[PDB]
């Protein structure tokens, strides 16, 4: 069951990135020009987690050459929830969905993403129940 879909471009604050038009399914925009140090805050749109436990986080990503990684966290940087490697997809607008699990406490969260290594674009993020 889906808890939230967050379009990557709908950040309340950011550093070092730029929006661009995406040709991915559904159109709209993606965040691009993501490099080490860059970040996206979704603190403006808190998401409610109904119960403590495991959640599946999905990211809609594109990467010409691979090598990227990100850290999913609360905005401001702590606690950190998890990290994920972003694979090469064949190009900047060739999209795939990647995923990992993290533990989240129940209640209102203000999420953020920190790029540890660049080379990827982000269309949206999705938070899902597991159990």
Ligand X SMILES: O[C@@H]1[C@@H](O)[C@H](O[C@@H]2CO[C@@H](O[C@@H]3CO[C@@H](O[C@@H]4CO[C@@H](O)[C@H](O)[C@H]4O)[C@H](O)[C@H]3O)[C@H](O)[C@H]2O)OC[C@H]1O
Q: From the annotation, which residues make up the binding site for Ca(2+)?
A: 7, 9, 16, 29, 33, 35, 38, 123
Distance CA(3)–CA(130), nearest Å, equals 11
- Contact footprint for Ca ion (CB under 5 A): 7, 16, 28-29, 33, 35, 38, 123-124
- Which residues 33-52 are close enough to bind ligand X by CB under 6 A? 43-44, 46
Contact 62, 89 (CB under 8 A): yes
Determine the 3-state secondary structure of 131 from DSSP: coil
CA atoms of 126 and 128, how far apart (whole Å): 6
- Please give the helix or strand (H or E) that residue 5 lies within, else none: strand 2-7
List 13, 35, 99, 107, residue binding Na ion (CB under 5 A): 35
Q: Is 20 helix (H, G, I), strand (E, B) or coil?
A: strand
Would you give the binding string for ligand X spanning residues 73-112, x where CB under 6 A is met?
Answer: -------------------------------------x--
Window 36-65: residues binding Na ion (CB under 5 A): 36
List, as residue ranges, the binding site.
7, 9, 16, 29, 33, 35, 38, 123
**Closest separation in Å from C-beta 52 to Ca ion:** 29
Total residues belonging to the chain: 131
């Amino acid at each position: 069951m889906v808890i939230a879909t967050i379009q990557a471009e709908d950040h309340s604050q950011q550093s070092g990135t730029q929006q661009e038009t995406t040709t991915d399914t559904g159109g709209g925009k993606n965040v691009g020009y993501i490099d080490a140090g860059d970040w996206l805050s979704y603190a403006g749109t808190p998401v409610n987690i109904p119960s403590s436990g495991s959640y599946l986080i999905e990211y809609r990503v594109a990467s010409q050459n691979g090598g990227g990684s990100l850290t999913f966290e609360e905005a401001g940087g702590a606690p950190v929830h998890g990290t994920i490697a972003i694979p090469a997809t064949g190009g900047w607008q060739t999209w795939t969905t990647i995923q990992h699990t993290v533990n989240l406490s129940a209640g209102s969260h203000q999420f953020g993403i920190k790029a540890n290594a660049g080379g990827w674009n982000l269309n949206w993020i999705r938070i899902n129940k597991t159990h």
